[PDB]
Each structure stands twice: as structure tokens, then as C-alpha cells.
Amino acid sequence: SKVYTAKGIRDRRVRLSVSTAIQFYDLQDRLGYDQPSKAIEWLIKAAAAAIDKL
Amino acid sequence: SKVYTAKGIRDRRVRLSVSTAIQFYDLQDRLGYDQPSKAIEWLIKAAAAAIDKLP
16 A cells, blocks of 8 residues: 655555545546546646646 | 545545556655645646547
């Protein structure tokens, strides 16, 4: 249930707010991914331009 | 930890893969947020252009 990160040990489970969970699951359905983790990974990839710009 | 949706009940807890967790927490750290949910909120706004292409 845990993972090493550069800033220390963290939980693999993250708790979404009600409002964010509603939006996230709507997106997971639209993307068609079976595992919610893959929709999170997709978001990280799709946000690359904003992430690059800090 | 349950959320109700038009499609039924879902869990507010999401289990990340090891690799996705490492990437996600690096982003959360770069953003400076202390709640993971706010980083996901940020991502949905930051990915808006791609989401809008989903047919």
C-alpha cells in the first residue's frame, strides 16, 4: 500500500474530494480506462505543457 | 468515502500504481499542494484542451 518517493514514503491510495471525484470519474468513463490509475497517468501526460511551464 | 453519481456509487479513494504514484507525488510536490485531491483538480484544468478532443 506504500511507495518510495524522492521526498519520502507515501500511500498509494489518494482520497479525492466529493467534487473532484465526480469530475474524475466522469473523465475516467470518457477515456474508457478500466483502472482509475490509468486515467491519472493520462492526465499527467495530457497536462505536460502546463507542467513544463511550472 | 462513497460518492453518489448518476451511474451509481463510486469510491472516493483511488489506488495508484507504483509508477503512477511516483509521478503523481512528484507533481504534487512541484505544485506545492498538501492535499492530493487539489493536484487532481489542477490536472483536470491543465489537461482541458486534450479532454475537449475526446469524441
